[PDB]
């Protein structure tokens, strides 16, 4: 749909859509930018992530409302409408995963880009896993696990423990363990070890980097407080 717009114009309009809180537009613009075939800059990767995180976040919140209504109920309308929202959510996840597979991940050579995209792949398989109930649900869960695990291996080799991407990845992998994999002890261990190793590296950081890292450490702490 965006094939006739300049890459730079798509990026400019994604930023405008973000300011207008028009996240569906933002995602379509960033999808078009990705499909230009060039690698994404750090800022552009963040725009891609913000756009789709907000779109799928609204779908997930709606699915949870409807799933809760459906559970209390057991006509076909509640199930039908939950299925409609669920199908739309799966479509958005498939779109993101398709962008990562064609061809963001294979062209991502630097640790910051490769870990970023593999974290995204884990996240969107995780969102698929949240609604999965059929023959492929175990494979969906393992696909999330595998993507997160590769990202973790690279991040531990190539990034400092305070790196915000590394911290956000560990945060989300810990949520995967707690919420999806039924592994709360793994979730807690990962969050604690991530927090403690970041704490011990804060002394190396500038004031601005310190603020970036401690913000995400607080989310790890919030989860540990919820879980223990």
């Amino acid at each position: 749909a965006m094939g006739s717009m300049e890459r730079a114009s798509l990026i400019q309009k994604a930023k405008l859509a973000e300011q207008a809180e028009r996240y569906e537009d933002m995602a379509a613009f960033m999808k078009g930018a990705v499909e230009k075939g060039e690698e994404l800059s750090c800022e552009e990767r963040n725009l891609l992530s913000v756009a789709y995180k907000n779109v799928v976040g609204g779908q997930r919140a709606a699915w949870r409302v409807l799933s809760s209504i459906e559970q209390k109920s057991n006509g076909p309308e509640v199930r039908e409408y939950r299925e409609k929202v669920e199908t739309e959510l799966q479509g958005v996840c498939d779109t993101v995963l398709g962008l990562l597979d064609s061809h963001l991940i294979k062209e991502a050579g630097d640790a910051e880009s490769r870990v970023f995209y593999l974290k995204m792949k884990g996240d969107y398989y995780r969102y698929l896993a949240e609604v999965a109930t059929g023959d492929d649900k175990k494979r969906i869960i393992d696909s999330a696990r595998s993507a997160y695990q590769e990202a973790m291996d690279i991040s531990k080799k190539e990034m400092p423990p305070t790196n915000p991407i590394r911290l956000g990845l560990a945060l989300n992998f810990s949520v995967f363990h707690y919420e999806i994999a039924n592994s709360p002890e793994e979730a807690i261990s990962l969050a604690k070890t991530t927090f403690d190793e970041a704490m011990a590296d804060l002394h190396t950081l500038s004031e601005d980097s310190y603020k970036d890292s401690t913000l995400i450490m607080q989310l790890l702490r919030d989860n540990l407080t919820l879980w223990t």
Binding site: G168, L171, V175, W227
Partner: peptide, 7 residues
Amino acid sequence: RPSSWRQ
């Protein structure tokens, strides 16, 4: 209910 990464 737990927090995943957010802005």
